[PDB]
């Protein structure tokens, strides 16, 4: 019966502290407006561990379902982005997208070289990614392999392996397929049924600061 | 080509990937100009391990000596900046400056609360900092304590404990006092004696991009 408000926001590029600010800002607006859900169209090659963990925590504290949607086609939620997905209420992926490839490294060196992460950091992230998978009823076996084998999956593979809940071409198909689904983690201690009958979709613009920071990045 | 040139550049703020680019740009200019040395006036309260390791490496491969100068008074080379200092050909400190407090961390929570990393990663950075100090003939006992005790030192303490080589109030005093000193690490396979008699000092201005990006990180 009731008209259900759903926010859609875009989050792109490397996961850093500005990204946390984006997640925080977009989720707050949606909580304040009593939204049914917020969908985040995520496209990230990776990023920083602390900002990622802050983002997962912000999503756990969210008073509304946060749906991570790997979109548009060609996008990925690789590295830090996979933890964000796994830490969210529902994951969707568009055709031609990617998820996984999470083997921690200390970082990239001068000439194509990479700085190896010590076994402790690796084990620490295996425990954390397995825990996010277990908490959200997702495939912990496969999530470990995102690390131990730098495994990356197509949307169809991700669904089949029990890592994501939805494969969808656009917001339309996403709302239709996810309508009636229960969130994979609780919202304020209860597993919520998503009501996407009678929905109004609202798109959230990035702010000045968002646009500036990312235009400096594109250069 | 019958000149003796010392370049001076400025590096201020968080050590990030962008800080690597500045170090690379300035050192490259000095190399291409066959400078006797480059002095880097360093003021940094923190930064990222990966960028720091890349900067130490770039300094190790430098074809000219790199002198890290903690300047102006009130500056610090804390956290990532101490590693950079310890990785370089010579360290000078201005009166009222600070070196140390190098504990590795995973970063900061939503609170701004401290997220310490696993014990074994502390041990990894202890090893790394001990290596840098021993490779440059500097006190690895005090260097370890930069981490294990969060130890921070004044210039005079740093000199007495055999962590730095010079205390100087300005570039001119720095040149006078470091003249005839041997680099603490090699330059192209050889420890080199600094020749600062009759030197031309050339200041490299930070670019608009440097200042803008620094100022944005700052907040």
């Amino acid at each position: 019966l009731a008209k259900n408000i759903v926010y859609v926001a875009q989050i792109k590029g490397q996961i850093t502290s500005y990204t946390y600010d984006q997640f925080d800002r977009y989720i707050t607006i949606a909580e304040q407006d009593n939204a049914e859900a917020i969908i985040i169209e995520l496209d990230t090659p990776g990023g920083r561990a602390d900002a990622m963990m802050n983002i997962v925590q912000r999503i756990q504290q969210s008073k509304i379902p946060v749906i991570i949607y790997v979109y548009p086609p060609g996008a990925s939620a690789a590295s830090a982005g996979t933890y964000i997905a796994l830490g969210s209420h529902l994951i969707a992926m568009a055709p031609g997208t990617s998820i996984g490839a999470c083997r921690p490294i200390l970082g990239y060196s001068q000439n194509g070289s990479i700085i190896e992460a010590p076994p402790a950091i690796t084990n620490y992230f295996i425990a954390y990614i397995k825990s996010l998978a277990q908490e959200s009823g997702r495939n912990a076996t496969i999530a470990e392999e995102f690390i131990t084998k730098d495994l990356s999956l197509t949307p169809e593979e991700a669904l089949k392996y029990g890592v994501i809940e939805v494969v969808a071409r656009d917001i339309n198909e996403l709302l239709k397929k996810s309508n009636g689904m229960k969130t994979k983690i609780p919202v304020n201690g209860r597993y919520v049924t998503l009501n996407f009958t009678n929905v109004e979709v609202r798109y959230l613009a990035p702010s000045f600061k968002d646009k500036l920071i990312s235009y400096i990045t594109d250069l | 080509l019958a000149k003796n040139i010392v370049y001076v550049a400025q590096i201020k703020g968080q050590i990030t990937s962008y800080t690597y680019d500045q170090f690379d740009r300035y050192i490259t200019i000095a190399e291409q100009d066959n400078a006797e040395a480059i002095i880097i006036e360093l003021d940094t309260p923190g930064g990222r391990a990966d960028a720091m390791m890349n900067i130490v490496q770039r300094i190790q491969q430098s074809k000219i000596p790199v002198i890290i100068y903690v300047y102006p008074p009130g500056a610090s080379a804390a956290s990532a900046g101490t590693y950079i200092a310890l990785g370089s050909h010579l360290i000078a400190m201005a009166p009222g400056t600070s070196i140390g407090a190098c504990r590795p961390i995973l970063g900061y929570s939503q609170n701004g609360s401290i997220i310490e990393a696993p014990p074994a990663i502390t041990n990894y950075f202890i090893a790394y900092i001990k290596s840098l100090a021993q490779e440059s003939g500097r006190n690895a006992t005090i260097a370890e304590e930069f981490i294990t005790k969060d130890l921070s030192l004044t210039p005079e303490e740093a000199l007495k404990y055999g962590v730095i080589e010079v205390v100087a109030r300005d570039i001119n005093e720095l040149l006078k006092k470091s003249n005839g000193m041997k680099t603490k690490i090699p330059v192209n396979g050889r420890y080199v004696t600094l020749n600062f008699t009759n030197v031309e000092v050339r200041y490299l201005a930070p670019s608009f991009k440097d200042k803008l990006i620094s100022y944005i990180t700052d907040l």
Binding site: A78, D150 | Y83, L106
Partner: peptide, 8 residues
């Protein structure tokens, strides 16, 4: 306080 990590 050097901040340590990222993933690929």
């Amino acid at each position: 306080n050097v901040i340590v990590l990222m993933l690929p």
